[PDB]
Amino acid sequence: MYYKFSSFTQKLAGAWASEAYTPQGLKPVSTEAPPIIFATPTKLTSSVTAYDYSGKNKVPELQKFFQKADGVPIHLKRGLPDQMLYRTTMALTLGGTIYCLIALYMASQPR
Amino acid sequence: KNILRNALVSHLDGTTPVCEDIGRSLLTYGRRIPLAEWESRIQEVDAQMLRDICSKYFYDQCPAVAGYGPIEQLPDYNRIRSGMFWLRF
Amino acid sequence: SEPEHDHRKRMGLKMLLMMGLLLPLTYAMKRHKWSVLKSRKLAYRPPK
Amino acid sequence: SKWLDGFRKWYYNAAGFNKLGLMRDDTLHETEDVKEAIRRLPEDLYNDRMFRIKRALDLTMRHQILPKDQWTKYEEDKFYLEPYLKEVIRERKEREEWAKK
Amino acid sequence: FFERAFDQGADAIYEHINEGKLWKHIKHKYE
Amino acid sequence: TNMRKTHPLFKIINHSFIDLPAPSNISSWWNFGSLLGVCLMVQIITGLFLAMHYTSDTMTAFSSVTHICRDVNYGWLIRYMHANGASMFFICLFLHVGRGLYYGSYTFMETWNIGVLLLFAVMATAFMGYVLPWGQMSFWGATVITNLLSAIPYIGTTLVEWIWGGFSVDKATLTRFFAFHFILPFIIAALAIVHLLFLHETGSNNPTGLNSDADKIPFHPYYTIKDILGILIMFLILMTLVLFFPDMLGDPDNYMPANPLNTPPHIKPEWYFLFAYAILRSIPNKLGGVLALILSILILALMPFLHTSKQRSLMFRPITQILYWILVANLLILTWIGGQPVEHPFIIIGQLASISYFSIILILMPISGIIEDKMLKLYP
Numbered sequence: 061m062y063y064k065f066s067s068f069t070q071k072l073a074g075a076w077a078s079e080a081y082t083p084q085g086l087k088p089v090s091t092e093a094p095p096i097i098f099a100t101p102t103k104l105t106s107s108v109t110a111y112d113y114s115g116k117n118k119v120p121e122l123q124k125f126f127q128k129a130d131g132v133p134i135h136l137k138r139g140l141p142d143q144m145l146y147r148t149t150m151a152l153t154l155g156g157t158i159y160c161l162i163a164l165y166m167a168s169q170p171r
Numbered sequence: 172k173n174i175l176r177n178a179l180v181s182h183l184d185g186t187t188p189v190c191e192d193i194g195r196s197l198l199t200y201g202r203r204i205p206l207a208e209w210e211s212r213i214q215e216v217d218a219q220m221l222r223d224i225c226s227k228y229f230y231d232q233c234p235a236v237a238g239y240g241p242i243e244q245l246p247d248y249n250r251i252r253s254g255m256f257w258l259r260f
Numbered sequence: 261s262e263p264e265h266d267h268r269k270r271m272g273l274k275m276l277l278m279m280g281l282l283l284p285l286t287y288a289m290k291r292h293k294w295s296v297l298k299s300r301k302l303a304y305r306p307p308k
Numbered sequence: 309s310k311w312l313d314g315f316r317k318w319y320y321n322a323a324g325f326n327k328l329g330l331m332r333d334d335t336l337h338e339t340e341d342v343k344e345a346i347r348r349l350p351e352d353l354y355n356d357r358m359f360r361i362k363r364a365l366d367l368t369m370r371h372q373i374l375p376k377d378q379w380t381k382y383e384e385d386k387f388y389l390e391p392y393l394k395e396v397i398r399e400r401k402e403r404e405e406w407a408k409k
Numbered sequence: 410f411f412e413r414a415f416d417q418g419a420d421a422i423y424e425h426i427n428e429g430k431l432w433k434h435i436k437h438k439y440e
Numbered sequence: 441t442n443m444r445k446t447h448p449l450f451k452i453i454n455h456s457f458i459d460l461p462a463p464s465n466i467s468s469w470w471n472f473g474s475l476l477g478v479c480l481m482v483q484i485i486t487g488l489f490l491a492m493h494y495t496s497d498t499m500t501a502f503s504s505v506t507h508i509c510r511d512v513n514y515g516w517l518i519r520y521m522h523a524n525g526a527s528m529f530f531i532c533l534f535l536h537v538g539r540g541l542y543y544g545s546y547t548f549m550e551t552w553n554i555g556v557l558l559l560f561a562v563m564a565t566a567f568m569g570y571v572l573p574w575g576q577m578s579f580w581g582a583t584v585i586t587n588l589l590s591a592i593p594y595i596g597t598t599l600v601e602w603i604w605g606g607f608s609v610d611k612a613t614l615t616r617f618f619a620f621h622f623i624l625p626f627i628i629a630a631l632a633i634v635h636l637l638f639l640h641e642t643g644s645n646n647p648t649g650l651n652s653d654a655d656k657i658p659f660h661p662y663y664t665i666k667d668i669l670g671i672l673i674m675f676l677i678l679m680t681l682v683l684f685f686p687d688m689l690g691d692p693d694n695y696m697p698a699n700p701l702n703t704p705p706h707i708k709p710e711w712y713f714l715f716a717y718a719i720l721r722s723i724p725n726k727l728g729g730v731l732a733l734i735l736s737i738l739i740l741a742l743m744p745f746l747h748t749s750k751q752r753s754l755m756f757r758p759i760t761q762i763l764y765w766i767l768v769a770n771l772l773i774l775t776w777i778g779g780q781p782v783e784h785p786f787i788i789i790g791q792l793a794s795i796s797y798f799s800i801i802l803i804l805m806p807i808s809g810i811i812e813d814k815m816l817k818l819y820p
């Protein structure tokens with residue numbers, strides 16, 4: 061009736077008796093209103109590395125890196141570069157296979 | 172600067188906003204910043220550091236947009252992102 | 261019949277290199293300006 | 309009628325609009341009679357229809373389809389716009405009979 | 410600052426792929 | 441306060457090119473007409489260059505064509521863009537009309553009528569511009585079409601008198617051909633402006649055929665960069681045709697000078713008229729042949745009245761999809777038969793293919809449409 065937490069700057073502004081000290085309504089029950097959600101369905105997951113730059117051993121901190129429960133297979137676990145050379149490897153072997161079949165079909169026919 | 176001086180002093184009227192400022196200052200800053208220190212921090216704010224800070228925070232950023240209601244004329248994210256910068260400054 | 265052969269093939273490989281340089285640029289620009297759209301997920305919340 | 313039933317089920321599967329989560333009445337061409345029958349719909353069926361159309365539009369934008377578990381099945385395909393459409397053709401044919409006389 | 414280098418690179422790879430038949434390769438013979 | 445919505449030029453540009461709502465699901469086929477627009481621009485540019493060093497004086501007209509190919513620097517290049525851009529123009533035009541037949545875009549009646557008027561105009565300009573370089577093939581095609589136009593009773597006589605301008609080959613014929621080939625592309629551009637203006641009030645069609653007001657996006661910057669990519673790809677294909685294989689589409693026999701006393705062993709226009717020539721190789725009647733060609737083009741304009749189905753696009757219509765693809769198939773059969781000599785067994789293939797084309801346009805799509813109507817429980 062004196063102060064209510066509001067005003068988008070996190071401040072105790074001034075409100076009314078039915079606005080500050082009765083934030084609930086005078087409705088009987090929760091009526092057949094349109095439903096609510098505050099949940100982004102993007103399912104975004106961020107994994108931090110947080111490694112050490114010294115110690116000259118570097119195996120136990122790669123051990124921490126590869127023991128993760130992301131569900132990713134270990135040949136896409138490094139992130140960018142393994143995905144890059146896996147994509148290029150599979151692309152060049154598909155191109156090589158189709159050019160191999162084209163070469164074999166061209167060699168099957170005579171001149 | 173004058174509007175911010177009036178905003179910082181005019182809010183601390185009575186006991187309840189002063190107590191709230193004390194509580195969240197000891198919870199966030201770790202200390203209660205006095206109003207004289209607030210004026211002292213306001214004092215050296217001039218135009219070139221204001222535009223430097225605003226270019227650091229507003230210029231060429233990806234914003235977050237929320238909308239509710241008849242928002243069928245609310246532009247796409249490309250138009251808002253393109254309006255976040257200028258072509259020739 | 262063709263006194264134009266060498267200059268035609270000169271402009272041919274110049275065109276080929278220019279097109280192979282400037283086509284992935286427009287492809288990446290189109291993919292950016294449509295990947296703003298292809299990440300959109302929609303939901304329907306009727307009052308039931 | 310087992311010949312017609314299985315062929316209708318196969319033709320519904322091969323028509324393709326069940327793969328994008330549509331009913332039959334969403335696929336109709338919107339003439340003035342179809343738009344008038346749309347205008348006579350209740351609000352909940354109207355909102356369902358426009359959400360299904362929007363879902364179809366941004367599903368075929370990506371050239372993708374719905375997963376097979378949530379395709380529109382043949383038994384749950386409801387002919388919601390059909391009686392309003394029949395009523396609209398009834399009034400239009402009555403109006404053209406009165407204009408002919 | 411890019412197009413002239415592009416033009417001379419395309420021209421240079423053109424005489425690299427085509428050797429012994431262009432007119433610019435027999436400048437030493439007659440002049 | 442903003443210049444995009446208070447300045448009249450920027451208001452027109454914003455309202456017709458930037459903030460125009462477009463469906464978010466249109467495929468690459470919707471680029472094609474825009475390509476046709478810039479294809480027009482390319483020809484006009486080359487047309488300006490062909491206003492430079494071309495004379496309408498038969499022997500020296502062919503000599504001026506050879507001088508454009510040799511004496512004028514980058515003149516051969518302009519001539520080859522003009523020819524291969526006419527080829528690319530008809531490729532894009534055929535795919536544009538195929539999009540219109542497939543995705544139910546013929547329900548826009550006046551846009552369809554402006555389109556078919558544009559299509560008559562552009563076939564006339566292409567044939568008439570084929571006459572201008574004055575080869576043997578252009579001569580013999582011109583004589584065949586003018587005699588076919590003179591075969592009609594008491595109407596074609598004054599048209600031959602105005603067009604040929606004399607007793608035999610003279611310069612007046614080529615001047616009036618060059619005048620008409622100069623003038624009518626600008627009329628094509630005017631009807632393209634009317635085409636866009638009639639499209640603008642009803643919106644663009646999506647491939648699903650549904651009402652796309654639920655999901656619409658601004659034209660800029662999505663379809664702007666999409667059309668830029670399409671323009672770059674079309675330029676790549678056109679310059680690949682010009683700079684690498686300049687005469688794989690062109691008829692080789694056009695390049696020797698015209699002699700009326702000799703008869704060439706195989707008369708042939710370019711490929712984009714050949715299917716129409718197949719109709720001219722279908723029935724042995726002159727005025728019946730002209731009626732067959734005119735009705736075979738005008739049946740596209742009569743096509744929006746034959747839509748008997750309650751759904752617009754062919755995306756959800758598999759039987760009519762099969763019918764459309766055998767329609768494209770036997771149209772390809774006609775455009776292959778048209779470039780063949782008149783011998784066995786090309787005559788029976790051409791006649792049955794023309795009959796099948798007329799049947800697959802006219803009579804069989806209503807039956808397929810009412811079958812589609814019955815198989816989904818909507819037909820009485």
Ligand code: HEM
Binds near residue numbers: 526
């Ligand atoms: C108004 C602008 C135009 C002018 C001034 C013009 C002028 C000419 C001239 C002088 C020629 C003969 C020289 C040559 O063959 O290269 C020609 C040829 C030709 N024009 Fe055009 N033209 C114009 C637009 C068009 C358009 C829009 C088309 C497409 C419908 C077209 C199709 C052709 C064709 C097919 C040829 C024959 C090319 C060949 O022999 O291979 N022209 N034009």
Ligand code: HEM
Binds near residue numbers: 473558644
């Ligand atoms: C002269 C060359 C032509 C040009 C420059 C041209 C231009 C255009 C443009 C810019 C559009 C809008 C973008 C698009 O949908 O592709 C369009 C759409 C359309 N055109 Fe053409 N057009 C031409 C020929 C034709 C012809 C011959 C027809 C008739 C068969 C036609 C019928 C249509 C239809 C029905 C649409 C609407 C399709 C849609 O928006 O989904 N056009 N045209």
